[PDB]
Amino acid sequence: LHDDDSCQVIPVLPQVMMILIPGQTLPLQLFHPQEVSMVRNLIQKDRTFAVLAYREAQFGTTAEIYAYREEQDFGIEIVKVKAIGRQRFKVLELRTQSDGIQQAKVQILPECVLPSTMSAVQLESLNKCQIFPSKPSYKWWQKYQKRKFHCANLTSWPRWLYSLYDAETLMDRIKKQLREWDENLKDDSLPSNPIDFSYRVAACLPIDDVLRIQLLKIGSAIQRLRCELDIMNKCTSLCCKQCQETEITTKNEIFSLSLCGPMAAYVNPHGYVHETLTVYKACNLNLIGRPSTEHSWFPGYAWTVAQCKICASHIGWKFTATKKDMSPQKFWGLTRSALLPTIPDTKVILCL
Amino acid sequence: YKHKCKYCSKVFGTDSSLQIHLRSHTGERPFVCSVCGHRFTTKGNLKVHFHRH
Amino acid sequence: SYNYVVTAQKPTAVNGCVTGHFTSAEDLNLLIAKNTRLEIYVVTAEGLRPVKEVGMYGKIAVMELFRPKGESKDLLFILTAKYNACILEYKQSGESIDIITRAHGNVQDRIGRPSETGIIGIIDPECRMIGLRLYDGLFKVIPLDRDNKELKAFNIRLEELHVIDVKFLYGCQAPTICFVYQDPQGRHVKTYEVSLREKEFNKGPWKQENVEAEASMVIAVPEPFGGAIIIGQESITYHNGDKYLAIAPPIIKQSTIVCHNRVDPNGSRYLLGDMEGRLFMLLLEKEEQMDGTVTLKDLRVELLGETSIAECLTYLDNGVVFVGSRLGDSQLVKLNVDSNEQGSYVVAMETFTNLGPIVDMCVVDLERQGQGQLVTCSGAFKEGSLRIIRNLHIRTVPLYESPRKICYQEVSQCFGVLSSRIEGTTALRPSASTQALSSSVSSSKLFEEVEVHNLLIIDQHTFEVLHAHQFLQNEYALSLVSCKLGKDPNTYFIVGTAMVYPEEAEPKQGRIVVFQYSDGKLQTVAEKEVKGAVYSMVEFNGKLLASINSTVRLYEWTTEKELRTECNHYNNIMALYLKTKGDFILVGDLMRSVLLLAYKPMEGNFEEIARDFNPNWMSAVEILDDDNFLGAENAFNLFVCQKDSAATTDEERQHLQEVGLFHLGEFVNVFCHGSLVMPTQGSVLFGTVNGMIGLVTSLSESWYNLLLDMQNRLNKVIKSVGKIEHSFWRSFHTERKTEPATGFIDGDLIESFLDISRPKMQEVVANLQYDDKREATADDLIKVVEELTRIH
Ligand SMILES: O=C1CC[C@H](N2Cc3c(OCc4ccc(CN5CCOCC5)cc4)cccc3C2=O)C(=O)N1
Ligand SMILES: [Zn+2]
Ligand SMILES: [Zn+2]
Ligand SMILES: [Zn+2]
């Protein structure tokens, strides 16, 4: 754990093209000796390398290695490694060294911890009533807003405005729609810390890369929550990233076949990771070939390559059932790097 | 590394090990995209689709 | 920018009141805390006599008197919000009155989370320690031995991390603290013994689990009985070891008891004030036994009457009580043995005007003499009032409801005031809306406690509510503007509202209503439906600028007397604050995101000139000039940012550079260009929560460098109560940051030059340079501060 605003020279994997959220898992599979030996030396040190944010990178996140496996198959030493994002940063200098790896002089960004809005206006006679009995309803929230924000009569703004900037209220509003995408998770699963909660939803939403960078560069966690909730309410249609305007699927089609949410990271037979979003119905997709069960990420289902009808780029795979006693008998698995969250027309702009 | 299969892009340690696997790609469309599983007729066709990822 | 801030009116709200023998052992004193000020009165049989008023370089957070063994009179412990601890002694030598500092230190720990229930400061009854609850899971102990002049302290880990209230218990063998805490199981009461030698916690005498769900207050009972009284919302219980009593009087259920005070030094009588102004008496009915013991038989609560919404209560003598109020005026009240004709034992004696909380204001030239008068919306709920401040002469116009916004329409010789009243729903009391001379209700069809919003038409001479217009059901009035629009020669009242429904978080519908007061009623001259909350409106050269959620929109007044959208500008931040100067438009949200927009008159659209996003809670903002912009942010700070003078890259021109930082010590709610008077340029008044009115004027670079020098020099000859340094007090402060001040000059410290001794006046002008570059005679600087005392 580095100090805030401090500087570190952290190595970079030259074949890691990805926006890494703090707390998000990064799966790696290295063949080359310079990449392999670099992983081993981090294990006997800090396990911390840099995942840069794009080939000109301006920000990024440090990754800590928490898993390591070795396979010596077919005369080639396979090294698979799982990492987890940790600290955000801004790049100061990138310097390529002897082998393919490179060093990065880096300044650590601090996680902006802001107090409550009423931390400055609350009267001390009512300080004793700031702790409320925990939540056992939608009338409990009408009391939480009244009680927590009573001192708004001392400012120029009502209570219902401070709720839109209240961290605890925004997480619950995001929790509501997140549960519509997954019949499990429950009130737990997601962290209670707003900073940790914002970084989980940042890695959970099916958003493109330039939208993931904006969530990284958003300073406060309260702003990161409002922008995240803004994406879920406005960007209801997912279009093909290539041709921009071909609508593949909408927000109401998302569901969770795997218990790990409606969007888990899966690995293909050659090391490529695919943040696959499972939806019920899809549009403007051409099926390539016949179904196949080989290396299927969902046992009992057969995958078929699905491509965009207009631009002929890869969008995902259609999964059909190989058994009758399975529901759904059909669903679509759309990879993230192929979609583009779109605000359907009636100028709507994402708000912080 | 070298000794890479031209159809699926798997790397082997020895050119010997390459050949014993080379006849698992029996078919008209033996070239497979290591990213999505797309099969193609020629190596050049696989390259164009690969570099669109 | 180089700016100059001077206090035009000291804070008026009362956040603390303690009594004791501070001046002399015989004298009974009343010490009152007004944010950054401390008033000391001697309580006479007639009333109250002022003795000495001092100011501090901090926001007084805890103010308590105590007398350790072997001390002549009582000593004063004061802790600031910035964690400056100090023990103070009163000392008078004829007429020279000075508050000496017997000990001082900074108790701030680098770690620790600031507690939810606030800073708590308690003292052992026998004065052997000072207990502080600043951070969760910690308890700072300051040994009260006269070798601790730097106030060295130690911490003790607290396995209970959510403490509600804590107090020191009376009549205990060892120093015992008794507190109420909450955990997943519920709310409980637990006691700890403190060992100033083991520096840890020992097992307390007793504990009671499963106390009231919303138990909020701990009252320590003196040694005649000992123990503690725990007061929540539903119950008043007494505990001591294995002695238990509890009552649930239905008379204290309509509100919550939030303050207390002991009436007799034996703990037999207690005063309780609630959130709505009620005053109760908690009597501990004792039963005299035959073996010399006195047991506690029952608890009894009787309603005494109504006062101002009391933040702090303290009993003086001869049935006189001081009601310290933050929302409304503080008062001296007299209690009677028998109730009056309405069943109230409380009768008012004196009332001290409290300007806080100022939620809106406006400068008006009432008497046309070019003097300038400030008329503010002040108070909350039944304490709401208008205050007409002059050159200071304050007139009070009570409204008995909460006033929100104000604007002056000279043509009607009238004030337009937005207000809200708390209530088939019936009013709780006759208010300004219910007592208007004429009353209208709005019709549109375009779209427990409840808020009813009204536009009140208040006469500029008599200040009587000529008309009260009740807005729609579930309609929340947000903005108010008086202006002429386009070619219309009539001046109108414009109101921007929002449709708030407890089910929808963000507002999706709102209204912009055009009103006119011609005869004795308000006519609705057309309306316009918008798909959001109208947060702010400003007149923009015969046109109406408005905010709709994140949208800034310029409206035009047609010949059909209707509003037509001209151009929009969609922002990625919530357009909450809206201020204009010429064709420049300043936009800001609650999170200190500052956006400068320019209306291009030749293109009929908006252009984004500059931007600056620094996530922090902003409360108010204002345009100083076409380049510099002033605002208020957490915590009680001011800031200025400007368009970059280095006009090299298009990138750099779109970044606003921060040039001013300053810990004002107040929570600014409204900025207002104007002055109270007939060298420096600009005059911006601001009202605050504590009732303080301040000035913001800009200095030349020549003067700024001079007054900054005189600042560091006047800070070497001025004694500060508690030995707090101006540099520390005025430095930009939030829990994450500590940075010195820049671009701001404390006029209060500069004005203290005219009140220091001439031998010390020369001490600061020695080796000074004045660019009139000769040295600065002591007489050149009274001329500069005499002119700086004329802005206010
Ligand atoms: O749900 C899904 C959707 C589709 C996705 N798949 C399947 C797939 C392939 O699928 C044919 C195949 C699968 C497995 C093999 C086994 N080998 C391993 C390497 O050495 C030779 C032997 C060979 C060919 C081939 C290439 C890429 C992919 C790819 O991304 C996936 O993994 N799971
Ligand atoms: Zn496409
Ligand atoms: Zn192969
Ligand atoms: Zn492919």
Numbering used by the authors:
A (entry chain A): 72 to 125, 131 to 212, 220 to 429, 437 to 442
B (entry chain C): 380 to 432
C (entry chain B): 2 to 392, 710 to 741, 748 to 771, 784 to 1014, 1023 to 1116, 1121 to 1140
What does the study report here?
Both globular proteins and C2H2 zinc-finger based transcription factors that contain a beta-turn are known to form complexes in the presence of MGs known as immunomodulatory imide drugs (IMiDs) that bind to CRBN, leading to ubiquitination and proteosome-mediated degradation.
In the CRBN:CC-220:ZF1-2(379–432) complex, CRBN E377 is displaced relative to its position in the corresponding POM structure by 1.5 Å at Cβ as a result of a clash with the phenyl ring of CC-220. E377 is part of a beta hairpin that contains W380, which is part of the cereblon IMiD binding pocket; thus, the shift of E377 results in a shift in the location of the glue in the pocket which is expected to impact the interaction of SALL4 ZF2 with the cereblon:CC-220 surface relative to the corresponding interaction with the CRBN:POM surface. With respect to selectivity, the weaker potencies observed for the interactions of SALL4 ZFs in the CRBN:CC-220 complex are consistent with previous reports of weaker degradation induced by this molecule.
